[PDB]
Amino acid sequence: MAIAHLATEYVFSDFLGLRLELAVDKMVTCIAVGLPLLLISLAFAQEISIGTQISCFSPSSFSWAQAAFVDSYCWAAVQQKSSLQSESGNLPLWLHKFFPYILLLFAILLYLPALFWRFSAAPHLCSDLKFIMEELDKVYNRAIKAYPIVEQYLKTKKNSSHLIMKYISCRLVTFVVILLACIYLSYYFSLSSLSDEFLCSIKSGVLKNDSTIPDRFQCKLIAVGIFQLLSLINLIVYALLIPVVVYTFFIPFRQKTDILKVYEILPTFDVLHFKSEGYNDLSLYNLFLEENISELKSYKCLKVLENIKSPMLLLTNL
Amino acid sequence: MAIAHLATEYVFSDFLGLRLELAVDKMVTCIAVGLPLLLISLAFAQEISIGTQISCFSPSSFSWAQAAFVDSYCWAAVQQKSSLQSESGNLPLWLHKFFPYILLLFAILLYLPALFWRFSAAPHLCSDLKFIMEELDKVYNRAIKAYPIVEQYLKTKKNSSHLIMKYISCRLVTFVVILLACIYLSYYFSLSSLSDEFLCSIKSGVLKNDSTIPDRFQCKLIAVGIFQLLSLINLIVYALLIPVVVYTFFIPFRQKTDILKVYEILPTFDVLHFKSEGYNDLSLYNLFLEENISELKSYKCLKVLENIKSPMLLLTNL
Amino acid sequence: MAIAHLATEYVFSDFLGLRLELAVDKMVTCIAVGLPLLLISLAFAQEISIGTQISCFSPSSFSWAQAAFVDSYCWAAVQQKSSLQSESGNLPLWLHKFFPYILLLFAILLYLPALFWRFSAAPHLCSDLKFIMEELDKVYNRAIKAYPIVEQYLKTKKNSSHLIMKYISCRLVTFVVILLACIYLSYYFSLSSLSDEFLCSIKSGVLKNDSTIPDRFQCKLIAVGIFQLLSLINLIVYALLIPVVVYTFFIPFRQKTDILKVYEILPTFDVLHFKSEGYNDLSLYNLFLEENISELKSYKCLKVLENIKSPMLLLTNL
Amino acid sequence: MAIAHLATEYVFSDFLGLRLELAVDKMVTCIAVGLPLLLISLAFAQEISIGTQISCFSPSSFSWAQAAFVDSYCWAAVQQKSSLQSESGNLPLWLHKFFPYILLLFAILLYLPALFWRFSAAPHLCSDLKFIMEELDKVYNRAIKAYPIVEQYLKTKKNSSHLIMKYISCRLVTFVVILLACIYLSYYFSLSSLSDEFLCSIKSGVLKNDSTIPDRFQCKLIAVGIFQLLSLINLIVYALLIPVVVYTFFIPFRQKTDILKVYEILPTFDVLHFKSEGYNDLSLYNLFLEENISELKSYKCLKVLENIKSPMLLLTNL
Amino acid sequence: MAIAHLATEYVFSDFLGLRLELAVDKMVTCIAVGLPLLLISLAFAQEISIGTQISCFSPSSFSWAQAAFVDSYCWAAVQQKSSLQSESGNLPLWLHKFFPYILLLFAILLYLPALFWRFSAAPHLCSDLKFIMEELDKVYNRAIKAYPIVEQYLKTKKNSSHLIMKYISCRLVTFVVILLACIYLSYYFSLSSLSDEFLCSIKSGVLKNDSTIPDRFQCKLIAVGIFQLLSLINLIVYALLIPVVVYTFFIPFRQKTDILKVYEILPTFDVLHFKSEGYNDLSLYNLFLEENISELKSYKCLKVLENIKSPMLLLTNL
Amino acid sequence: MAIAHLATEYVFSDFLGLRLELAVDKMVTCIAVGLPLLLISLAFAQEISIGTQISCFSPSSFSWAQAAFVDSYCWAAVQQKSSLQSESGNLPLWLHKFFPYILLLFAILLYLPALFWRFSAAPHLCSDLKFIMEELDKVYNRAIKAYPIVEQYLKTKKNSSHLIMKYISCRLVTFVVILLACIYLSYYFSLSSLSDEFLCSIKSGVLKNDSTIPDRFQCKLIAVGIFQLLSLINLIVYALLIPVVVYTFFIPFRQKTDILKVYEILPTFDVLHFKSEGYNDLSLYNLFLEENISELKSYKCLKVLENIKSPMLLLTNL
């Protein structure tokens, strides 16, 4: 398995019948959630791990049992205020210990907006794309045979902002969490490299008076050099996601092709070129249509004719 | 696998043909049961665990075998009243040891109400939704063709409170268990951080008179700093579930759309707008209908027309 | 996996086309058999286990090899009468060692009655439910069209007690085993907490004369504090099963609905309201019918009409 | 997994379209073969095993390497005549070491008779049951319509003893092996509990003259206390199988119902009540028919009528 | 599993209905990505690994605990500037430690261009190959029966460079990354073999003044001799990929057969021998057609005739 | 699993609808590639491995940590020219260490020719066998009914050498690699048995001046005695493959039956007995036909008649 298992598991696989998520939003989510899970898996891989996360230099007079006590006590002590000293203060010792939980937290928090979309919006969307697509094929069938229900339906969606407000808020939560992650990772990479070293003391309770125990044990959080390096990789990639996420908000500018111009070739269709520059649900439907109706039989036929036009009898001779 | 396995297993998967549970009640149950199982799995992950749950500072004269005896004896001693001292008293030592069983107990107890619903109510519900849905499609078919059995059936359910009392009691047990969990986790997070340290003695039986053994060994429950931190995460999330659970009791206020108004467009239907403000089973059926009949072919057709109305021949021209 | 694996494996899964076991008898069996298997799995989970089941305080002069001999010899000695002392006597040392085999024995013994039902009664039942159900649908079909073979068949089952004696004896064996388990677990929880400590001696054979070996080693059965706590959980749950099991014997009182009253609406049916208060097989067939014929197409139609009656042409207009 | 895995694997599963083995013979074989495999799996489970199967008390002057030599040499020595002493003699030391192979041998030897039946008799049986069953349905069809080939066929099987001699010898081998197993397990349970202790010597070859090595090491076969206890469980269950196996030989007395009396209701059938009290193959066919033809459509119809008789037009009105 | 598992997993399996990637580009990608994953898996295989990645020669007075501290501290120290000395400088110590992450990075970066093709170009290609292939079968059917839409369609693709610019840039990124990998691997193989040895010091913080600790520990990165050898294998194979990748850019020279000459046998076809020596999308379509239309029924028939020609009635007599 | 897993995995399984590889070439490839993978898996099996691949005799004054340093340093040193001595010179120490990679290299290199055949020739072959086979069935159908396209097609293949040059070169590469493997394995088996022993020195850098360290440590490559023995097994089997591979080149002599003589019985066929003694593609097609057309319905019928002839109406009476 080794490192190579992790490549097969998190890079070469979608580890997470309509497309109810846009390809950009899928890839952003997959990178945002998937990268910290890979980095956690790499940081503790046996190829780079040597062993325990900590070790402490106990005196040569200590038995192996007393040394194992010091190592394990000081692993507990990194989060106890009275039994530590570090020139950094105690705060970075928490971050060095809990680093894999903190990356996991970002991975989870970045998934929740997409999970909310799957539940709160996808089923309300799915029914309506299926309707609109089938009605467009009827309009194509009506033309080859040579009510405006879907035109009236879309004209109604033009006067709504319900689904688009769910979408933008889902994007906005993702932006905020990525921004906070970049702030945290910038700080954690800025921590002084020697802040993995701290002084520990076991002299509490019964041990407080024992003259045979040294007043301080030096300990080192051996993995920290891996965590800081991998945090920079995470910071770089998330800093590249930030502008892509911001681009997603510009829905009325994201429509790549005015596909209804392809149907406009038919005399049965109507001038519903409703590229709504107001943030209205129909504009978001256009994106999900452009994601899906590239599969429509009518579109495939009509787009060939529209490209060649750069004649209705031709549709019967295809 | 590492931490990342746990994300794939408990976050990215439904690890637990009609929908017989409401989406809110599913998500509440899935979070309430699933979170403590994740937290237990995190608390002992090899990324954060160092080793044994306890260690004790045996004298340097002790052999490795005698030290292993002290460690294992004191792991047994934390629940034996005569062979301990702690300034906290002995109670928190039980909670520190049995923490993963206590979280497991809440996970189980929070699942039982949903399991009871699966057995006691779902099969009694499933037959009747199937009936009501099919009869609504007949009423739609009768209109396009242009006995009131289902109207009489629903009018009978209006005079019953059998299923709704099973539902409310299932919700009420979930509320009580979540409240008790929040009380426990608030206490366990309030335990003094040093209550993971205690004094142990092996001087019982034959050892009681041995002058070579110290009267007290200091021991530390190394994992406790993880348990307390993770208990706060659990307390926060459950405190967010409490108001959502309470909202579920307000069944007569939870109906989002008066879907029978969509069928009211048909002349064959009748004014059964029985939004019963009394807690009557028909009101609960309306919730399960609104969860399911969004899939009905009649609803999909009629809701388009109802939205456009914001004409029966149109139904034949769709 | 950890503890959380065990929840998924034994709580969230049925780890054990007609329903040939009643839902109450299924759940009783599933709890009775499944709980001790979960408790065994919990008692040795690495979250709560520290290591070996025993340790002994060998002298500091002993080599690590001699200490490992003492630990392993005394694990063998707990069941050898001559090489022990305990104030409890030797009996509880057997129970502390063999605790997981004893719980396994109850798990097996509680499954055998249900396995006997699967073999000895289910195939003799399955043929006859299939017959009775199909004949009831014919009686429904005969009414809508507007020989009494099944009435004569049921009237014959009214004069038999063959299957019901298999059922009651299966229930009776389950009751006896649960009662004996509650007696054992009450005793094992009553064992003094310090009865996990005992004195061991290796001075037999060649070692009997060696002055360098101490006459007694103190040993502790470290897991016993877990076993006693978990035995209380098992005792509580089985004490709750006892009254449920006893309720199962009252077959002539368990019939919840007189379903033949729903068929009594038809003029083709007959007054076979044979709620036999004598323990006769037909009374047990009524329970298995009430478990199954809720799926019958005739029942679904007629129960709607019976509820509305709280008219045969209506059956053609459904 | 623990112990509980073994319950799921060997108790709750058939771990081993006609039924070509009788239910009694299946269950006998499944218990006879399956129980020793479970007992072997239990005897070395980590819940009850402490570690190595042997340990020896080497002197305190021995290095850990020399102690590991003594432990491993003496594990080899238990089967070497010159390098042992035990008051029992050397024989039980073999049985204590090879106990799991001996139980495995019985498990295998008890399976071979059933495997021989699967190969030597089942395919010769399978063709003929299929024939006889189909011809009985024709006789039923011939009656409802109101050559004796199958009657002549069965009358020929009445004059044969080929298959029944394969069956009885298969049963007889199973009886002999179970009896020998009960004899062995009775002896092995009768072995003195201290016969797990023996004296070992490494003083051979170059070591023979070394004055620093003791002339005897005491060793203990730590698992033996488990093996003897589990051997009693095996002895008890096999002693219960013995009378069940003996019952299987009484084929002419085992026929529970004279099913041809149910067909005797038809006027097309004939008085082939050939309950042959001589051990003739037709008597064995009757057992396999009674195991299978409970599934026959004709039998299901005619047995209802036969029970009600406690009229041929009724067969058309079912 | 051993080494042999890796052969089955990465050599004998495609570990990564139209063919939307050319066979050359598939094999280049599969070697470029797959080889470093195999080499990482080999470099840490238990057949060649001895144990830890580092060891240090601590003084004989050090306890085993202090030695384990030195080993683990120095594993952390290889990336800390102040606590090292090496005649190479510190740079190669980073490369020796992070070697498996660096190979993984190249494996990932070499996959991204092919993943971009899968997303950005394959679905835009897939629709159009399906169209062109079906129209070619119609042209074949039209000939056997003895509008030019596809000819006009292809004549339009001749005036576009959209898809080919995606393809060339995808190839160009692959070339750049392979070139940079060859530069890195050439350097890493050129590192002096003794640069796996370095001097470490633990004398920081509290230890800085301890006279009992030596001022330098010698440490060796034991795996480095494997990494350098395997880096040469990777460098050789990538140096062989470079000319193959460069060959892929010569699209207008890569067309192996002028397949439209086979259709030119038909009188319905037209002289669209548009081997565009300008880099125009139609030239790239010809490559994907030559990859796919070898499966076309028309091609299979016509290529036989074209080879024999080295007659239309023959098509009806095949 | 043990050794026996490897038998099931590599001997009893094809671990690697037309047959596009000849049975001889399949078996040669399967043995040539599969044997070294089995031998690698055997050489490190826990039944024959004791532990580490190396051990060194450090002084008795060395700590366990210093000994582990010597063992791991010398494992690195076997490939470093300055820190070794062996009377063999350093070369065989490389071969002893890298033996499993060298066998893996031969396993890979022997697979590539067959993988090249799968890609470069099989799809060009597959279309043409399918054609030729179907046309032969038409010729059979034409005879029973009582154009020469396939005769003209085959007569064209008679004037080509494209595919046969791919085949012979694929065979030739396999021959060369097997020959080189036999040369290497002959040498590696000829290495003196004591060349697994070498002298190591850790006296470099800081250690160079330490008088407490011996100038040489003796080390032994413990596995080498396994590698040399298994190399002889590999050499023997490959030496048996050499003449089989050479036989494959004699394509015009390998045709076992002149199958077209069976079709020559039909009056519709023609005297295409083109056993081309020149190396022409049609001769290779004859081999692949003889491998496949034994499945043809026509062949099965006609070969019966041809054997009986050792009459066309008979074909209708089969």
Side-chain angles (χ1 to χ4, degrees), chain C residues 79-305:
Chain C
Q79 62 185 112
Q80 287 168 345
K81 192 172 181 176
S82 57
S83 65
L84 294 174
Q85 165 61 351
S86 182
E87 295 179 20
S88 59
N90 300 320
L91 186 147
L93 281 60
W94 288 80
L95 279 57
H96 295 319
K97 178 166 178 183
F98 293 111
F99 181 77
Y101 291 175
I102 294 164
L103 288 190
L104 177 68
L105 179 62
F106 295 131
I108 292 174
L109 290 177
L110 291 165
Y111 184 68
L112 298 181
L115 182 66
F116 173 84
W117 186 259
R118 178 188 171 215
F119 274 75
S120 190
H124 188 79
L125 173 67
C126 181
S127 53
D128 292 30
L129 292 178
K130 286 175 177 178
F131 171 74
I132 294 157
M133 286 190 300
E134 288 182 4
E135 295 299 309
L136 286 170
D137 280 346
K138 289 178 188 170
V139 169
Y140 161 89
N141 286 346
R142 290 176 189 174
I144 287 177
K145 196 172 180 182
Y147 292 105
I149 307 187
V150 71
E151 302 94 305
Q152 291 170 345
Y153 197 67
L154 297 179
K155 186 177 180 180
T156 307
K157 295 296 191 178
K158 197 182 180 185
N159 196 33
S160 178
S161 298
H162 173 64
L163 181 62
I164 203 164
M165 183 161 63
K166 290 181 179 179
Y167 181 88
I168 289 171
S169 59
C170 170
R171 297 302 79 205
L172 184 61
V173 175
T174 304
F175 175 80
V176 170
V177 178
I178 291 184
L179 178 60
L180 290 173
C182 295
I183 290 163
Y184 171 78
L185 297 161
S186 300
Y187 180 65
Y188 186 69
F189 182 70
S190 302
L191 264 46
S192 303
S193 185
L194 302 180
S195 63
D196 63 353
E197 289 175 9
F198 71 97
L199 306 182
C200 179
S201 193
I202 76 183
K203 285 193 177 182
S204 300
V206 162
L207 306 184
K208 191 173 183 178
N209 302 336
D210 191 340
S211 62
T212 67
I213 302 178
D215 295 340
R216 293 298 184 278
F217 298 86
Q218 189 154 288
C219 299
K220 194 159 195 160
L221 299 171
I222 290 137
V224 170
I226 315 303
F227 301 159
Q228 287 197 306
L229 180 65
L230 271 57
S231 80
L232 177 65
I233 294 172
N234 205 23
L235 176 61
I236 287 167
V237 178
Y238 283 10
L240 296 176
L241 292 186
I242 285 173
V244 179
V245 171
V246 172
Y247 160 76
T248 71
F249 298 116
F250 295 93
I251 296 166
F253 302 92
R254 282 175 64 199
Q255 175 170 302
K256 294 182 180 178
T257 64
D258 299 343
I259 297 170
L260 279 63
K261 189 177 179 179
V262 180
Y263 287 91
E264 187 178 54
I265 291 176
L266 302 183
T268 54
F269 195 57
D270 190 14
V271 198
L272 285 82
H273 300 301
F274 300 160
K275 185 223 182 186
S276 177
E277 301 196 328
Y279 282 89
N280 298 33
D281 292 333
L282 181 61
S283 67
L284 184 58
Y285 276 98
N286 286 11
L287 270 57
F288 283 107
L289 289 167
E290 181 161 53
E291 181 70 61
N292 284 276
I293 79 181
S294 61
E295 289 291 5
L296 255 62
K297 297 182 179 180
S298 57
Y299 176 78
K300 287 173 180 171
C301 298
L302 297 167
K303 183 58 184 175
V304 167
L305 178 58

Side-chain angles (χ1 to χ4, degrees), chain A residues 73 202-210, chain B residues 87 194 197-199 216 218:
Chain A
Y73 185 102
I202 76 183
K203 285 193 177 182
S204 300
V206 162
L207 306 184
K208 191 173 183 178
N209 302 336
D210 191 340
Chain B
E87 295 179 20
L194 302 180
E197 289 175 9
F198 71 97
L199 306 182
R216 293 298 184 278
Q218 189 154 288

Side-chain angles (χ1 to χ4, degrees), chain E residues 289-304:
Chain E
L289 289 167
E290 181 161 53
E291 181 70 61
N292 284 276
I293 79 181
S294 61
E295 289 291 5
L296 255 62
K297 297 182 179 180
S298 57
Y299 176 78
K300 286 173 180 171
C301 298
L302 297 167
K303 183 58 184 175
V304 167

Side-chain angles (χ1 to χ4, degrees), chain A residues 173-187:
Chain A
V173 175
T174 304
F175 175 80
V176 170
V177 178
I178 291 184
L179 178 60
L180 290 173
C182 295
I183 290 163
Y184 171 78
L185 297 161
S186 300
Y187 180 65

Side-chain angles (χ1 to χ4, degrees), chain A residues 18-24 129 254 259 285-295:
Chain A
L18 283 67
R19 297 183 185 178
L20 303 177
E21 298 179 59
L22 302 175
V24 177
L129 292 178
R254 282 175 64 199
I259 297 170
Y285 276 98
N286 286 11
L287 270 57
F288 283 107
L289 289 167
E290 181 161 53
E291 181 70 61
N292 284 276
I293 79 181
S294 61
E295 289 291 4

